[PDB]
Structures are given as structure tokens and as C-alpha cells.
Design a protein around this ligand. Sequence first.
Ligand SMILES: CCCCCCCCCCCCCCCCCC(=O)OC[C@H](COP(=O)([O-])OCC(O)COP(=O)([O-])OC[C@@H](COC(=O)CCCCCCCCCCCCCCCCC)OC(=O)CCCCCCCCCCCCCCCCC)OC(=O)CCCCCCCCCCCCCCCCC
Ligand SMILES: CCCCCCCCCCCCCCCCC[C@@H](O)O[C@H](CO[C@H](O)CCCCCCCCCCCCCCC)COP(=O)(O)OCC[N+](C)(C)C
Ligand SMILES: CCCCCCCCCCCCCCCCC[C@@H](O)O[C@H](CO[C@H](O)CCCCCCCCCCCCCCC)COP(=O)(O)OCC[N+](C)(C)C
Ligand SMILES: CCCCCCCCCCCCCCCCC[C@@H](O)O[C@H](CO[C@H](O)CCCCCCCCCCCCCCC)COP(=O)(O)OCC[N+](C)(C)C
Ligand SMILES: CCCCCCCCCCCCCCCCC[C@@H](O)O[C@H](CO[C@H](O)CCCCCCCCCCCCCCC)COP(=O)(O)OCC[N+](C)(C)C
Ligand SMILES: CCCCCCCC/C=C/CCCCCCCC(=O)OC[C@H](COP(=O)(O)OCCN)OC(=O)CCCCCCC/C=C/CCCCCCCC
Lengths: 70, 459, 53, 54, 140, 347, 121, 107, 56, 98
Amino acid sequence: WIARTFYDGPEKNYEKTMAILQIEAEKAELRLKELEVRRLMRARGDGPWYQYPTIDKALIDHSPKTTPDN
Amino acid sequence: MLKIIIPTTMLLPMTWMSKHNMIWINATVHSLLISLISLSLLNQLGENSLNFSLTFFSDSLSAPLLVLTTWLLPLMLMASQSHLSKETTTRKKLYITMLILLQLFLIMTFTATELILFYILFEATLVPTLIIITRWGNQTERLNAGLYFLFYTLAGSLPLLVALVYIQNTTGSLNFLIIHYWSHPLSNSWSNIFMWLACIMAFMVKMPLYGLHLWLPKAHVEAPIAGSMVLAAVLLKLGGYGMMRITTILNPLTNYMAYPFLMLSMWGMIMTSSICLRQTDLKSLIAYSSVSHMALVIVAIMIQTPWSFMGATALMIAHGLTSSMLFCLANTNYERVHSRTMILARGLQTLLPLMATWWLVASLTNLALPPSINLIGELFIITASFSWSNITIILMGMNMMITALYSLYMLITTQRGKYTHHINNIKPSFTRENALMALHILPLLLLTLNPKMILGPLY
Amino acid sequence: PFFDVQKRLGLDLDRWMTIQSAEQPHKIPGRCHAFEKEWIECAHGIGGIRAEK
Amino acid sequence: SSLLDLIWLETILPKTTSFIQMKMSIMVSNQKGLIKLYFLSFLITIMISMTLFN
Amino acid sequence: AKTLLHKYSDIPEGTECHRKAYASTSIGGATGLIVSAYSIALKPPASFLEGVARTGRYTFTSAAIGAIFGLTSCISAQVREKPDDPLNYFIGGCAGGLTLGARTRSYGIGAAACAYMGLTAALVKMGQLEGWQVFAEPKV
Amino acid sequence: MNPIIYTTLIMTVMSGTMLVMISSHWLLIWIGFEMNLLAMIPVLMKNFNPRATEAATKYFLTQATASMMLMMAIIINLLYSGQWTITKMFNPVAMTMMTMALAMKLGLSPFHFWVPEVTQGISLQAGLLLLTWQKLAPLSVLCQISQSINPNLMLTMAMLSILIGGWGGLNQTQLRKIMAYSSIAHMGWMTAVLPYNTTMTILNLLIYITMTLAMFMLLIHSSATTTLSLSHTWNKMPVITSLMMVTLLSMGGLPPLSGFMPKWMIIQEMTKNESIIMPTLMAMTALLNLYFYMRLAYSSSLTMFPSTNNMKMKWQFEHTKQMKLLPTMIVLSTLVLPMTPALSSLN
Amino acid sequence: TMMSGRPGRVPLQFLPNEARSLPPPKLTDPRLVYMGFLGYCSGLIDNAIRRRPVVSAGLHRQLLYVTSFVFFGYYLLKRQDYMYALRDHDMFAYVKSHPEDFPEKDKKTYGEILEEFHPVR
Amino acid sequence: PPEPTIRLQEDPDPEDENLYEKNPDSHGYDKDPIVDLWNMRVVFFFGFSIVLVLGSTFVAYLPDYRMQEWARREAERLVKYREANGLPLMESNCFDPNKIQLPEDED
Amino acid sequence: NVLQIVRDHWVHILVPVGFVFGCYLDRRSDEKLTAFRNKSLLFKRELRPNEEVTWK
Amino acid sequence: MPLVYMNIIMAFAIALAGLLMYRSHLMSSLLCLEGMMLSLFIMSTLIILNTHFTLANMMPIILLVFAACEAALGLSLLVMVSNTYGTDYVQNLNLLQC
Ligand SMILES: CCCCCCCCCCCCCCCCCC(=O)OC[C@H](COP(=O)([O-])OCC(O)COP(=O)([O-])OC[C@@H](COC(=O)CCCCCCCCCCCCCCCCC)OC(=O)CCCCCCCCCCCCCCCCC)OC(=O)CCCCCCCCCCCCCCCCC
Ligand SMILES: CCCCCCCCCCCCCCCCC[C@@H](O)O[C@H](CO[C@H](O)CCCCCCCCCCCCCCC)COP(=O)(O)OCC[N+](C)(C)C
Ligand SMILES: CCCCCCCCCCCCCCCCC[C@@H](O)O[C@H](CO[C@H](O)CCCCCCCCCCCCCCC)COP(=O)(O)OCC[N+](C)(C)C
Ligand SMILES: CCCCCCCCCCCCCCCCC[C@@H](O)O[C@H](CO[C@H](O)CCCCCCCCCCCCCCC)COP(=O)(O)OCC[N+](C)(C)C
Ligand SMILES: CCCCCCCCCCCCCCCCC[C@@H](O)O[C@H](CO[C@H](O)CCCCCCCCCCCCCCC)COP(=O)(O)OCC[N+](C)(C)C
Ligand SMILES: CCCCCCCC/C=C/CCCCCCCC(=O)OC[C@H](COP(=O)(O)OCCN)OC(=O)CCCCCCC/C=C/CCCCCCCC
């Protein structure tokens, strides 16, 4: 009677634990991958992250400058 | 797990919206109902755990501690009802609010699937205790005691946060389940040695270890009765729970690492039990007895064998109940005498026979008389230590003898002999105090019928 | 920190004075106009780090 | 009780920390408010930084 | 600058005791001079002669501490025939601490110096061995 | 002064800060700093007395020296590269001098000496403005040029600031000096994460500004500038003392209070970069800030100090002027830990 | 991860247009409930400071506090979710575009791996 | 020395109040007899009657989620089978060696 | 007397409401961990003729 | 980097050091600040003229203007300090101590 009215079967807890473990393992591997990607992007500069601004080339004037040799 | 947490949270609006003369009645009733609700968690499995969700799980190490934490609150309310009589409604409501917050923090601490959440709640429990000690304290040294209690804890625990964040950066997860399944050996390196020290010392300070046990007599003597109860019953067990949870990552480094601690505890139990023999204070004597018991629990955890873990769990539960009862008895004496010194009020068995019976039962259960769970944990830890080394028994032997001595000493100084002639304000014991002692003692003698219910996950 | 209001509104509050090769009055060239032009064109959009290497 | 618990265990961790922090606080906070000394110290640290970190 | 660091670190631990002692003495003298300059700038005691005497006292105390550190640590490492052991640095560090206590003439400060300099020297040796970084570069 | 003049000066201070924050040209940044410096001086001298004049002249001297060093760094940078845009510093110790100028502007050690004096000299509102708003512009510039900074010098000055704040707060009975040393220690905590993550610097800035606003408004409401003057507040406004004690515990970095969020994150960030010893030392040193916060809490609300007779008359009056944002500041500085991941908003 | 310099980023845009492709937080989100609770606590403290009946002094003021807190919390949660989505998208794209830096580990069973055993004695 | 020898204006320390004097049958709960008696009743009923009795009965009759009788029956059936087959009870190896691939030393 | 004892005894109802709300929240949180329902190797089972989910 | 720029930077460093010495006479502090801004003006003007940055010719004047405005403010402050003590000695400002 106690098991019927208050508690459930072992399958419920078993599968809930399986789902929890699967989610946590994905989160851990994602954390490692993110750390590695951060390290790679910062050193190389190739990636979208860690982009530091440079001079815009639309500011340059392209006209004759009163002297032939610029 | 929210079926326990939400009623505990609702305890606060109920208390603050209560009628000015119905706070104690409402609080005790609903606390007892919440305790009854907590009993459902005891039906554990031999399999992994009771994983309710991603945030909270239950274990047969966590379940007895949760049940004890829930059960302690009605007792603390009943004990505090006496000396808060001449106090305004707002401040009594604040006191009850602090007790409720302490229970909520402890409940969330004991489930705590993740180690950073565990640390956050483990240190959140610190604020209500500090405020209770430093606000509703009688003597002028409550400020110094609060400072000691705060700073010992924080000095121990600040390296723990750095160690935890480093461990998550390397491993990738702080979750208990992931950590257990993905545990890998720690090489014997200086960096690993310091990581072990940072992981262990935070829980070592709260047991507390013999070297670091100074804050405890101050905090216990200067805190009110509810503060003493919560410190002796639950707050000391947080270190043991943390060690049992965190030790899995530590191996195989623990064997070499454990020797300084094993020696400190095996000698400090003798030192503190001997200190108990020459004491002029009830509260200090109970505090030192608690230190001895928790030193034995430290030894059990450091040996790290199945029998060690079962003995440590049983001893933690039994010591919590016994020390809470002892502090309650000392407070009942103090509220009549206002001196809190053993040698002043004497021969109380002649004047208060039933209270003397309660004293006898409490001293017997502190003495570890079989088949009480106190001796169950005592014997399991002693056997595990003997298997660890056949010489440890000698020290253990001394400890047992010394323990009995001071226990009966405390029973003989205050209850036996001739009553002091001058004291005349010793009124008959109230129904509230007798109910408090009965509610303290009956769970122990009920649990000795079902020891497996408190023997932990390694049963 | 830096709130790039000029780019959001297209105001050009102080970008005209940042470099030598940006529309000097009467088309007077800087002493190092060609070198700065080459360095700016090379490093445009690459980013500071790859730009530095 | 007295030699170890009341005296030496108290001397080592809490009392030593209290004494050291008290002495450091007294030394650091005891400045007479003379900007002469403050800016002489500023010159000293500026030259030390110019000589040490490059 | 880091020239003194390069001079001290380049010499092998178990050889050239005098060179290690000289490098340690130079580092100690530089540290003592810096501390003396700080004290003079923050507190002008009474005059020029008292100030220069104070600077000389501080510099010589620090130089003696460093010299004892270097000589004792190097000699212990050489005699024990076990280099790269932080225990040698512990012993040398509080030989220096004991010399500091003797200079200041206080037994308590001598014992405190032994504790808190042997531990520091052992920690520095462990950091050198394990590659701990006091000022780590931004990795990510 | 005239309220119109005060409003104009406050708007000029804010406009100088905004000019620093929005401009991409070094000269415009220097001009914004000059504008802020110029408009700040009368605000420190709203209440005319020799103490306020001394504080204002000390502040002016320090800030003018910092501005001169900033201009010299800018000119050296221009000399070694014909660039005015705020970008990588392009040069050696020109960056060192830029860092020194910004450190003197912020009050970091070893340039911390002026903060306690100026804070003690001025009133509580001027101290609030000085310790809250005057940190935005230099920190914005440092965040912009963070990839240029030498980590050794920045970390050294950050650790020095933390140590000096912790030690100097222990000896104070004045509340304004306590706030100044707290500011120094918090800036030390802020600048130790600039080489690694500027978002953490901004998060620490937001949390510190909220806590400082709550603390200063509580101090203004119960108009006390001394420990004993604050000890008389319980006899009139016990709820104010309770809120103040909770805020002080939050400023100590205790979990689960809000002030724990920055240090935690900062420590976490510094562990990602293989740095352990400095986070450990920073926590152990912030223990001192906690100690003197806890002493103030003891003297404020956990114990009841003796009162005076005339206090009874104060029982019959209520504050005419009420601060609207005070309730919000307390809640934000106390109960925002569960909303920690919101720091991804790049605050 | 400093995303200030991300290409194609509008300077002062609180929520970009591409954020509209993400599921909005539900109105019953626990974080929104916490923000409303924060607003309610702010209202209670406001009542307490001005010496008014804490629970029942101003219902309109407490309602305004709760509503404003919920509004700001909803927008803040949207921005939070968008920024985390951007981080994950960038990480996945970088992993996809740099195969040589993230090799596929050879799956190995515990039956063929030798792990050192340390007895507990 | 015209000092009043009084450091400050202080209330005298009040004497302890007895709950028995103004109310026999005082139960040590409250000074109000009705609240007193009802508090005693609710504590006794919700502690001794509800928790200690019903909770103890509930804990006593908890279902076998630890699987002790299940383990006993499994061991009984297993030994019944092994004795008959002539198998030597419990094997030394917890896992079958054929599916374990040792690394060859060649030293 | 109804509508009078309520104003004084209304507080009692709060703890049980919290309990039932916590039970409901526990079930609702449980509903989000069904990814492995009837998929464990130990309990792969064929559904009953009138069964949709093994557990709720 | 030619020697003239080095001489100007040395002059600026000397002015800054003299400002940091504080023998007396806060008026000398203001004088040191003005010498510093003069050196800044000279070296910035030399650098700008040399590289023919035509639009940068704005910057020195601006600098001068702003710096002179600062001087005015400083002078005002000095007067009030003197107006309390009668002399501009540095050691008179010893009321505020750390
Ligand atoms: C973990 C998360 C879950 C829990 C959350 C925890 C926080 C929650 C609350 C946060 C803050 C909000 C409220 C605080 C405002 C302060 C107002 C106040 O004092 O109370 C007076 C007021 C009653 O007094 P009154 O008649 O209005 O007038 C008297 C004057 O107000 C005042 O009379 P007085 O001035 O003459 O009395 C003087 C007294 C008065 O001074 C105070 O009481 C100050 C109030 C505390 C400071 C608050 C700081 C900010 C919040 C920080 C919370 C910290 C939590 C983290 C853990 C660390 C613990 C410190 O001060 C002293 O005695 C000086 C020494 C005090 C001892 C040491 C100080 C420690 C205080 C720390 C308390 C921390 C917990 C507070 C919980 C709530 C307390 C009200 O209390 C209330 O009635 C309000 C309580 C809450 C209302 C509940 C209504 C909900 C029920 C219906 C809805 C059902 C809900 C479920 C829905 C579905 C069901 C069907
Ligand atoms: C003869 C009987 C002997 C044994 C008596 C046993 C008594 C047990 C009492 C202790 C119960 C502990 C609480 C258990 C809570 C966890 C279980 C919880 O979920 O049960 C809920 C219901 O819990 C009960 O309502 C708790 C009752 C609490 C009250 C106990 C009696 C005392 C009440 C006193 C109230 C006030 C009395 C009057 C005062 C004046 C409904 O759960 P549900 O989500 O469906 O679970 C479905 C499981 N399935 C799927 C397998 C079916
Ligand atoms: C005060 C109340 C109690 C507080 C808590 C006390 C408990 C903490 C004490 C820590 C226990 C020991 C720490 C390190 C133990 C390592 C083992 C060592 O002792 O043995 C030899 C180590 O030799 C020497 O011990 C070297 C270290 C000497 C320097 C340490 C200082 C010694 C006394 C300081 C005690 C002060 C502690 C408190 C500080 C505040 C083995 O030689 P070796 O094979 O080479 O090293 C093996 C380790 N490897 C593999 C990582 C390399
Ligand atoms: C201390 C608690 C925090 C509360 C802070 C005050 C709350 C009131 C603020 C009211 C609304 C402010 C939002 C401003 C409207 C538009 C903002 C938008 O235009 O700006 C964007 C940026 O949006 C804002 O930065 C977001 C501010 C939100 C702050 C909330 C985070 C709080 C930390 C976590 C604690 C939880 C607090 C929850 C309770 C409020 C674009 O920034 P961008 O030009 O591209 O780069 C500059 C910033 N960089 C350099 C760092 C990259
Ligand atoms: C006053 C003088 C005496 C008068 C009374 C005379 C009568 C004496 C009888 C009382 C005790 C004598 C011994 C008789 C024992 C018989 C009952 C016993 O057999 O039942 C026990 C049952 O007791 C329980 O197991 C232990 C009690 C549970 C303890 C929980 C504590 C209650 C909650 C309160 C809060 C908790 C606070 C502490 C936190 C941990 C053991 O049961 P068990 O052999 O297994 O199996 C039962 C049958 N099964 C197989 C169908 C299941
Ligand atoms: C009384 C407690 C016991 C104290 C015993 C020693 C006391 C003396 C130590 C004083 C503080 C020393 C601070 C510096 C220690 C440096 C240790 C260290 O850096 O190891 C970090 C290690 C490896 O470093 P990486 O560079 O990342 O590895 C890459 C190469 N393998 O990583 C970690 O494990 C981080 C964990 C933090 C270490 C904890 C530091 C503090 C000391 C440990 C706690 C012991 C004291 C507790 C105080 C007790 C008060 C109740």
C-alpha cells in the first residue's frame, strides 16, 4: 500500500538518472570545447571572438595631393 | 525535493503574518508537519540515489541528515520560547525567521547536486548563525566568539572555492554524479598536494580538527540555546558530509596525506576528553565532548573503509541528538540558576527527580551504552581503525574510559550530593522542558531498533 | 566603455582627425601618406592580432 | 587545558594574525597628511616602475 | 630589473656556492635599498645623517639575510646530494630567518622568521619545480 | 549655490564622462577628462569650509598631474606612430605612463593617498558622487586599451590596492575614510581582471556602484559620519541599521549576498588563465575588509549603544526629504546572486 | 570570449533582429518570477523605510515596482539568451572550420585500457 | 568630587518572573493560560501522536527498495543451480577474461 | 463564526498549499526528463494495448 | 628618435620631479604644472610640424587653451587656501591625514 500510494517504480528513477547523466556529460564536454576554442581564437586572431579594431580604410583620401609623390 | 523546500519557505510569511501571541504555536505545528513530510526521503535504494532533478538529489547519507535538520527546528523553537518572553513581537519574529532561513540553507546544502551550489549554501548557513550568536547573546564576549566563528570558517573555506573552480576548469564538471563516474587518480605532486589540502581543510575546520577547534567553545558558550543546539547537532556534520562527498576525487593521494590528520585526531580526542575532566562550565564540557566525538568521526572518514563510513554516519546522527539534549539540560539549569557553573547548584536529583532521570539517560547515551547507535558508530569506527592498525585500539581504549569518566562526573557534580542551601528559586520543571527532553531522547531509542536507516550508502 | 555613437548615427565627430591620410585641407599630403595608406589598407578588417603579425 | 588550548594554540593562529594585521594597519594608515611625502613616494614608484617592468 | 634574477637562476643549485651567495647578497641589498627609500620618503626621521644610517642598516640587514640564505641553501643542497629538493631551501631560508632574529635580537622574531621564511623558500622551490605562475599571461 | 548652477555643473560632469566614453580620438578623450575635472571642483565645495577647500585643491592637484601624464603618453604614442585613434598602444613605456595616469585618476595604489583625504574633507553627497561616477571614464579607457597593458604592472598595482585598502580600513573610525579604503580595495579587485576579461571588470563596477550608492544613501538618511554618531541610529531608525548591516555584509563578499558575485566570477576567470596564487591572496586579503565591515556592523545594529536625552525630540519628527532609489539599491546590492548568468548581457 | 569586436555588430543595439529567431522566455519563467519577487521586496523595504504599514501601505506602488521589475527582467533575459546563443554558434562554427584542432578521439573500451589500481589499506 | 557616581541613567535589572505564581498549571509555555494550554496540546499532539507514532510505523513498513529479499532469493536460486552443475560457487574473476584484452609486455 | 475566525486563522493554510505546490512543481520538473523513458537497456518493454507511457 | 625630443622629455620629467619634491609654496606646484604643459606643447608642436599633419595643427592651441583654463582654476583654489592661512605653504594643509 505504501509503495502504491506514495512511491513509484525503479524504471522512473533509472531513466531520469540516465537523462541527467547524459545532459551533464554534454555540458562538461561543451565546457572543455569552449575553453579550447577560446584559447585558439585569442592567440591566432582568425576567429570571430577577440577581434580588436583597426583603422577603417574608408577614411583614406584618394585624390591628387598637390605633389605627384603623395 | 521541492515538497520539502516550499513549505519551509512558506514558514516565513506564516510567521510574519501571525497574530502577536500565536507565533510559537503556528511555528511548532508547521515545523513538525514539515518534519513528517521529510520522513518520505528515508526509503532509499541500494542503487545509485534518489535523483529528483538536475539540481537536487537524495542519498541515504543525505536523508538522515535532512530528517534530523527538519526535526531540530521544533525543538529549537520550544527551547527558545522561554528566554524570549520579555521580547517584542518584531524581534521574536526575526529570531524565528533566522531559524527558518538556517533550516532552508541546510536543506538545500544537503541535496546540492553541484559542488559550487553546495559551497554557496554551506557558507550561506554562516550568516544566520553569526547573527543569532552576536544578537541574542547574554555575555559581552559574544562579539569575539562570532568573529572567531566567522574567520576560522572563512580562512578554511576561501582556498576551497579556488580549488573547486580549478577542478571544474580542468575536469569540466562539478556535478557529483559526473565526478564519481569520471574519477581519475591524482599523481603525487606538489600541486596535487596543495589541491588536496585546499579541498580538505575547509571541512576539517568545521568538524573541527584538534588543532583548529578553538572557535567552538567560544561559539557554544556564548550562543543562545537554539544556537548551541544547531551548532552541535547539524552545523558540525556539514564538514563530515563535505569530506565524504569530496574524498572520491582525492584518492590515491589520501593515504600519504591522511597521516598528519589521523595523528592530530587520535591525540586530540584524548586531549579533549581529558580537558573535560577539569572544567568549571557545563557548556564548555559539552563542547569539548563534541570535539572528541567529531575527532573520532574525522578518523573514520580518513581511514575511508565501508565500516568507517557507516560508523561515521551513525556517530554523527547519535552525537547530534545527544549533544542537543545535553545543551538543553544545561540551559534548563541555567535559566533557574543564572550562573552556568556546575559547582554552584548541586544535588538537583532531590529537588527535580524526573529531570535527574533525563540527565541520567543523556549521560548514558553520551557514554555510548549498547545497543544505542552511539556505540554502534563507536564500535564500527573502532573495528575499522583496528583493521587499519592494531595499535589504534589502545588510544581508542583510553578515549572510551575517559569519556565515561567525565560523563558520570557531569552526572555526579550537579545531580548527586547535597543541594546548595542558599538557592531557593528552583521551581518544579515545566511540561515544556520535559517534553523537550522526551522528544530529544525517544528518536535515539527508536533508531536503535532500525540501525540500517542511519548507516549511510555503504550499507 | 566605448559607446560607438558615431557609427550608429553616422555623425563623424572626430574621425576626420585620426589619421594623416584623411582629407587634409587643400589636399596637402602628409610626409608619410603612402606608407600609412599601405599599412591601413593591409590591416583593414584583418583585426588587430592578425594585423600585428 | 591551559598550556596548549588556552595559550599556544591561541598564540599561533588567531593572536599572531591579530598582531600582524594590527601592526600593518598602524604602519600603513599612519600618514601625517603631507603631500610632500606622498609625491616623493610617487616619484620613487614611478622611477622604480620605469626601471623594473621593461 | 630581471638581470639579478637571470644571474641567480643561471648558476646550478649544487655548485658555485660563492656565486650564489654573491647573487643573493646583491638581491638583498637592492631590496633593502628600495625599502630604505620607501621609509625615507614616507617618514623623514630627523636629518640626513640619521636617514643614511637607517638606509645602511636596512641594506646591510637585507644583504646579510640574502647571503645566509644563499650560502646555507646551496651548501645543504650540495652536501645532501639531492638537488631540486625544497627541504634544502627550507633550511637555508630559516638560517636566514635566524640571522634576522639575531640581528634584531629577539628570540620570538627569530622563530617567527624561521617559520615564515622557510615556508616561503620551500614554496618558491615548489613553484620553480612545478611551473607555478605568479603573474600568468592571459591564456584565453 | 544656485540650483541652476548645480544642475549645469552636474550635467557638465556627466557630459565630460560621456565625451570620454563615446569618442575615438585621444584629444577628445583628454578634453572630456578636462571638462569633468573642471566641473567637479565646485561640487566638492558646495558646503564652504576649509576642509572642503583643502580636499578640492588636493583633488585638483592629483587630477591635473594625471591629465599631464595622460597627454605625455598620448604624445609619445603619436611620435612612435602617427595615430590618434584609441587602439593598441603601439609603444613601450608610453603605455606605462598611460597606465600610471589612469591609475592616479582611479586612485589605485601606489597613487591611493588622495582618496581618503578628499573623501574625508568633502560631505557625504560629494563623496557619493566622487566614489561612484568618477570611475566610469578611466575604467572605460582601460577596458578599451586592455590588450595593450603589461599584465605584470597592472596586477602589481591591483594587488597593492587590495592590500592597502584592507590594511588602511582597519584603523579608521570615520565612515568616509572607511568608504574610501573600500573603494581602493574594490578598484584593486576590478583592475586585476582587466588583462583577462573586461566584462568581469564592468560587472564588478556595476555591483560596487550599487553597493556604494546604497551605503552612502543609508549614511545620508541617518546623518552620521562617525562610528559613534552611527551608533545612535538604532534608537530612532532600527530598520535603517538592519538594512545597513545587511549591506555591509554584502560588501564583505559573503555568500549568498550580492557582493559575492564579482569576486567569485573574477576568481573563476583567473583560474581559466592558469593563475591561482593571486586569487588566493586576494581572497585572504579581502578578509580584512570583511573584518572592519563586521566591526562596523557590531557597532551599528548587533549591539545597542548608549543614547542621549535630547534624542527624544528627534522621535517626534520625520525626514522631510526622502530618497526614492534607496529601496531599489538595497535590493539590488543584496539579492541578485541567482541572476548571476545575466552577466552574459555584456553589462 | 570578448564579443565586442564581432563582425557585423550594430553598436548600440540592445536586441538585434536575428535574436527574433530564438524562442522568447515564457511569461512563467522562474527568473521572471524572481525579478517580480525582487520588485516586491523593494516595495516592502520602501514601505518600511518611510515608516508605513509594510504589507498594506501602497498597493499601487508595489504593483508598479513588480511590473517594472518583470518588464526589465523579460528584456534582460531575452538579451542573455541571445548572447549565449551567439557564443554557442561561434564555438560550433569554429570547431567545424578547424577540423585539425579537434580530432576525433579513437573510441576505446575499458576492457583494453590498463588503469593502475591502488588498494585501500 | 561632586560626581553622582552614576555612569548613566539606567533601568534597574528586573527580577525573574515566575509563571507558577500568577498561574498554577502553567505548563511553562506562555503567561496567557489559554494560549499556554493550547500550545501544550498542539505540541503533544503533533509531536508524540503524529510524528513519533505514525512516522515510526511508516518507517517500519517501508517497502524493500534496498532489495534484500530480492538479493536473498537471487542467491538462493543461483546456489541451487551451481551446486547441481558442479560449478565451484562464486568465481574469482568478476569479469570474464576472454573479453579483457591485456597489453603484451614482450620485455 | 465563519468570516471572523478566517481573518485570524488564515495563516494555517499556507504550509499545506506550499506542500501541494511543491509536489506539483516536482512532477512538472520530472516531465522534462523523459528523454530516456522506455529506452533503458535494463527496462526495454513493449507497451501495453492501452498504455502510452511507462511512467508519468 | 632625435636628441631634441629626448631633451624635451627630460625637461618634462624634471618638471614632474620638481612638482613631486614639494619643498614649499604650492605656487611652485602650479609653476611645475605649467612647465609640464609648456614642454608638452613644444614637443607636440615639433612632432606635428615635422610629419606635416595639417589637421593636427589644431591640437596644440586646444591644449594650450585648456591647460591655461586649468591654471586659472588652480590659482583660484590657491587664493582660498591662502585666504584661510595667509600663506601658501604646503605644510599648512595637514588637517587631513590618512
Ligand atoms: C532564501 C530565499 C527565500 C527567503 C527570502 C529571504 C528574504 C525575503 C524578504 C526580503 C526583504 C523584504 C521584507 C523586508 C522589509 C522590512 C520590513 C520589516 O521589518 O518587517 C515588518 C513587518 C511587520 O511589522 P509592521 O507591523 O509592518 O511595523 C513594524 C515596523 O515595520 C518595524 O518595527 P521596528 O522598527 O520597531 O522593529 C525593529 C526591528 C525591525 O527591523 C527589521 O526587521 C529589518 C528587516 C530585515 C532587513 C532586510 C534586509 C534586506 C533583505 C535581506 C534578506 C537576507 C537573506 C539572505 C540570508 C542572510 C540573512 C541575513 O529591527 C531590530 O530589531 C534591530 C535588530 C535586528 C536584529 C538583527 C538584524 C537582522 C535582520 C536580517 C533579516 C533577514 C531576513 C528578513 C526576512 C523578512 C523580515 C521582515 O513585517 C511584515 O509584515 C512583512 C514580512 C513579509 C510579508 C509577507 C506577506 C506574504 C504573505 C501573503 C502572500 C502569500 C505568499 C505565497 C503566495 C501563494 C500562497 C497562497
Ligand atoms: C495504519 C497506517 C499505518 C502507517 C501510517 C503511515 C502514515 C504516513 C505518514 C507520513 C507520510 C509522509 C509524507 C510523504 C510525502 C511523499 C509522498 C507524496 O508524494 O504523497 C502525496 C500525498 O501525501 C500525503 O498527502 C501526505 C499526508 C500528510 C499528513 C499525514 C497525516 C497527518 C496529517 C495531519 C493534518 C492535520 C490534522 C488535524 C489538525 C487539527 C501524493 O504524492 P503523488 O504525487 O500522488 O505520488 C504518486 C506516486 N505514484 C505515482 C506511485 C502513485
Ligand atoms: C596547527 C593545527 C593543525 C593545522 C593542520 C595541520 C595539517 C597540515 C600539514 C601538512 C602535512 C605535510 C605537508 C606535505 C607532506 C609531503 C610529504 C613529506 O613530508 O615527506 C617528504 C618530503 O620531504 C620534505 O618534507 C620536503 C618538504 C619540506 C618543507 C615543508 C615544511 C616542513 C614543516 C612546516 C609545517 C608548517 C605547516 C603549517 C603552515 C602554516 C618525502 O620526500 P620527497 O620524496 O622528496 O617528496 C614526496 C612528495 N612529492 C612526490 C610531491 C615530491
Ligand atoms: C547591480 C545589478 C545590475 C542593475 C544595473 C542597473 C539596471 C537599470 C538599467 C536600465 C536599462 C539599461 C539598458 C540600456 C538600454 C539600451 C542598452 C544598449 O543600447 O547597449 C548595449 C549593451 O547593453 C547593456 O550593456 C546591457 C546592460 C544590462 C546590465 C544587466 C547585467 C547585470 C549583471 C548580473 C546581475 C543581475 C542583475 C538583475 C537585476 C537588475 C550595446 O552595448 P555596445 O555598444 O555593443 O558595447 C558596450 C558594452 N561593452 C563594451 C561591454 C561590450
Ligand atoms: C513505560 C514502561 C513500558 C511500557 C510499554 C511496554 C511495551 C514495551 C515494547 C516497546 C519496545 C520493546 C521491544 C519490542 C519491539 C517490537 C517492534 C519491532 O519489532 O519493530 C521494529 C520497527 O521499528 C522501526 O523499524 C524503527 C522506528 C523508526 C525510527 C524513525 C524515527 C521517528 C521520526 C521522528 C523524527 C526523527 C528524529 C531523528 C532523525 C534521524 C523493528 O521492525 P523490523 O524487524 O525491522 O521489521 C518489521 C516487520 N516487517 C518485516 C514487516 C517490516
Ligand atoms: C592549515 C592548513 C594547511 C596549510 C598547509 C600549507 C600552508 C602554507 C601555504 C600558504 C599559502 C600558499 C599559497 C601558494 C600555494 C601554491 C599552490 C599552487 O599553486 O598549486 C595550485 C595547483 C596547481 O597549480 P597550476 O599552476 O595550475 O598547475 C599547473 C602545473 N602543474 O592547482 C590547485 O590545486 C589549486 C588549488 C588552490 C591551492 C590552495 C592554496 C592555499 C593552501 C591550501 C589550503 C591549506 C591552508 C588552509 C587554511 C586552514 C585554515 C582553517
